[PDB]
Design a protein around this nucleic acid. Structure first.
Ligand SMILES: [Mg+2]
Ligand SMILES: [Mg+2]
Ligand SMILES: [Mg+2]
Ligand SMILES: [Mg+2]
Ligand SMILES: [Zn+2]
Ligand SMILES: [Zn+2]
Lengths: 480, 480
DNA sequence: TCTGGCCTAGATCTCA
DNA sequence: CACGGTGGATCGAAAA
DNA sequence: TTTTCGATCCACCGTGCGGTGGATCGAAAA
DNA sequence: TTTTCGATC
DNA sequence: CACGGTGGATCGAAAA
DNA sequence: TTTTCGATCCACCGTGCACCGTGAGATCTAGGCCAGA
């Protein structure tokens, strides 16, 4: 007879970020005072962690990697989700389809243990694939929806290996996942069968240009258009898209930062107005303007702009992208760009990252108007692949992945697990053997992202929704 | 009326590493389950934190720094210490002296916030001063002793500022702290006057050469001995010591790593047998042997040797050294050094870092024998300033600081506080304003290192003992 | 004509 | 030999 | 017999120094 | 040619 | 317009 | 009235890319070239 059910104790251990010693200490220090039954014995929590694991035969953990068979992971994910549904009896005998999004990214700047000289690459950086369930569709009628589709609390890991992400490992992992996705059957939970629809939209431009048939990052992966070809519009409108590439959903996170960098790189060269930095005094005018723009940003908006930092690279952050767009008048006064163009870009990014249903006709109209405005204002600086992919091909990309609103398709989820992965590799693994450390990092990822647990898990409800701009409210489609 | 005393709740908050939200979640979730009282309201803990602060007029927190007047911090430290004494009346009306060790170090590669552009140096690296009480002496008879003299749980902060530790700022803070030590009056705690004796031994060699009357790091700051002179023993024995520099006690942490690195830098160039790598083919042989030794260490002992790390310089950790001295036979066959030299160095390092009383006649004998052995073995590689300070001047700097056994005078604590400072700046500050963030980092340092709290606060004990090498135990002074 | 010794000069170590 | 940890594995005893 | 719970143990981590931009590959400018 | 610039992470 | 969070400050109402 | 205790807020963090050795300073080896045998 315990006051906390071992699963509620597991939720308390996950939300408070406690460790075996810390939980045992909590328990014993509650015992010492005179209230015996307040927490289950850690044995019970170690036993309740087991409901969340896929069977041992499906998970393959070794020194330099840890993978789970995608079919088994999805079986388990659905079996857990059905313990969240209000009344799984209520839904009638109509076929079920779980829509989820998966994708991989590389987390660098890992702490390098001195142990287990293994065989591959040591451990400096991991490259992992994540599968987050977005929605459960019963013949169109949504029965279960992920309340925070970009949160890391539902993002399931498939496999993670200590290999630096390069073109070949990316291609091989994508081929493996495609074979595993083809070869999977609908799961079965309490007589209801669930067919899985997996979209690889948690992805970033580097991996995306890897996957498509396109050689350099200078060209769009959808139109194979060379960098100077992307100025004029008609040659682009007559282009023929490569096949199945809309599956590489518009990356909403990196769009912010990269279009920010595009507007910046236009601001830096406003004194000589050319795309290349080649010439007499081009570099020098560029660098003087660069330093002045950095310092003016620092003064007024109190934020670092394009300064190198260990790990991540630049301190060109997500929140820096938010703040570069928050007040277009101020940012225009600082950089010298046109305020209406920056405002148009902020509106487009709000519409995309909103997570609300977007109307393709009005969005395409907005986007082509914005591209005309851009070419009019700054035609010399050729649009970078992300801002081009955003303006021209954004409408079609939104239209294809219409089942779930784009912006619910964000790679941010996977990026968030980086901040979680370290916190599980440093403080929650057992360091005896590398195999044990990886096995427990994977156990922690599974337990943390379990829908039944992460449903009844304390959290912070302090993010009340923000007010859109005067134009996104027309661009979006609200039902309320 | 409650079950957990607010001070014990505060201990449970500091030990479990809980935040305000996590504590409130703990409390409310325990309430919801039918236990009306198991934890005090977070208001009670916020009010119990105030016991541990020094008065507001002595703590000066600003955007770029936060300091405390030394006399007030010491008043508070003793006032707390007298709350953990077994018997406060049993100590008689006899003079009391608290012997404590203080010193500063710089922690670079901090989290670089984008905020509060205030003029100086931004915030990338802090330079902070620490004061840890070692022992309470009643006319030679100990009443209170710090059970773990290098544990960051007792290390009190004096001041911390966001500036790069450099010769000028180091000299200025040393001058200021010397003045503050001169002007301090004995504290008055419940009819007992406690006079303070502060020794600046938590210090690294770089700061130590900054402070002494010595200009270059390559010279032994005690004897101002140039690196080419440091081979001959008698000539050095003739050298007159700088004034009062014995106060800068033996740095037990860094001496270990620098001895490891001296033995290594002897191993690397074992082929051509000269100090400098200046020559024809010297660089190439040196680097080839260096790569060979690195790979052999990798294979046999599974530890990184002299390859760069991010943020902490090189991958030469304290544990890398402690493993480099675990079995001198292996490392001897690995590098090419003599086994008995490494054995002797490991023995004196156990003697120093043991934290037990040392017999300076036997230690001086052992050290001059080891110097003779080093010269007879390798005369060409001029002893590195740290290993020379360790062998020649080690007996004298031990005998001077004989009141508390050296190794209890260890800078480890200061260094260890870095790992905590980060964990408090990132996870426990309030990020609204830099001034607020520094105020809360300082409050967290104070509370975490409060002797009354950190005494009765749960802790982990698995490191009970490690057996000594035979010559070390013949060198030490055991009393138990 | 041989030969060692002074003397700039910049490349190397050392500590963090 | 710095100190505070890291979580399953496993033995052993007490329940049940 | 089977479950439950503490107690030990394994063999390592992370605070111990930073710096400036890099990797890669096509693609545009001279 | 060829020789540097840049987009992406 | 990502999401989970950071702790004192202050208000307001309830308990004493 | 004074102490308690929850609610709300403030304005930001951190996951979003790299390698490779750095920094300040005196100090030491190179070897260059001239003054007596
Ligand atoms: Mg990426
Ligand atoms: Mg230092
Ligand atoms: Mg340090
Ligand atoms: Mg990433
Ligand atoms: Zn295109
Ligand atoms: Zn000396």
């Amino acid at each position: 007879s315990t006051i906390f059910s071992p699963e509620k104790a597991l939720g308390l251990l996950l939300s408070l970020k406690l460790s075996k010693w810390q939980y045992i200490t909590l328990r014993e220090t509650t015992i010492r005072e005179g209230s015996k039954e307040i927490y289950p014995s850690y044995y019970k929590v170690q036993k309740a962690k087991l409901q969340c694991y896929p069977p041992k035969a499906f998970v393959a953990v070794t020194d330099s990697s840890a993978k789970i068979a995608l079919q088994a992971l999805l079986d388990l994910t659905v079996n857990r989700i059905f313990e969240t549904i209000r009344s799984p009896d209520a839904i009638q005998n109509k076929q079920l389809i779980l829509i989820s999004k998966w994708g991989f990214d590389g987390a660098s700047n890992q702490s390098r243990y001195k142990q287990n000289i293994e065989s591959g690459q040591g451990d400096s950086s991991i490259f992992m694939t994540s599968l987050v369930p977005l929605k459960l569709t019963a013949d169109g009628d949504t029965v279960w929806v992920n309340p925070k589709p970009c949160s890391p609390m539902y993002c399931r890991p498939v496999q993670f290996s200590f290999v630096k992400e390069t073109k070949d490992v990316v291609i091989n992992e994508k081929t493996a996942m495609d074979d595993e996705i083809e070869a999977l059957v609908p799961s079965k939970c309490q007589g209801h069968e669930i067919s899985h629809k997996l979209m690889m939209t948690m992805i970033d431009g580097k991996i995306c240009t890897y996957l498509s048939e396109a050689k350099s990052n200078a060209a769009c992966y959808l139109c194979l258009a060379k960098p100077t070809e992307m100025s004029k519009l008609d040659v682009i409108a007559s282009k023929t898209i490569s096949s199945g590439v809309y599956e590489f959903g518009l990356s909403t996170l990196h769009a912010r930062i990269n279009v920010m960098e595009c507007l910046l790189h236009i601001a830096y060269r406003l004194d000589f107005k050319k795309w290349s930095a080649r010439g007499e005094g081009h570099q020098e005018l560029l660098h003087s303007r660069k330093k002045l723009i950095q310092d003016r940003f620092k003064d007024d908006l109190n934020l670092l702009i394009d300064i190198v930092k260990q790990g991540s690279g630049t301190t060109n952050d997500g929140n820096t992208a938010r703040r570069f767009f928050e007040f277009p008048d101020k940012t225009a006064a600082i950089t010298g760009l046109d305020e209406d163009l920056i405002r148009r870009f902020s509106v487009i990014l709000q519409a995309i990252t909103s997570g609300e249903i977007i109307d393709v006709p009005k969005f395409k109209e907005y986007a082509r108007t914005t591209a005309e405005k851009y070419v009019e204002l700054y035609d010399w600086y050729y649009m970078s692949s992300t801002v081009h992919k955003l303006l021209i091909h954004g409408g079609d990309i939104i239209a294809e992945n219409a089942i779930v609103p784009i912006g619910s398709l964000s790679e941010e989820a996977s990026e968030a697990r980086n901040k979680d992965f370290r916190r599980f590799r440093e403080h929650h693994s057992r360091k005896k053997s590398r195999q044990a450390s990886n096995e427990d990092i994977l156990n922690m990822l599974i337990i943390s992202s379990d829908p039944l647990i992460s449903f009844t898990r304390p959290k912070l409800d302090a993010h009340k929704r923000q007010t859109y701009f005067k134009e996104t409210v027309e661009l979006l489609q609200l039902q309320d």
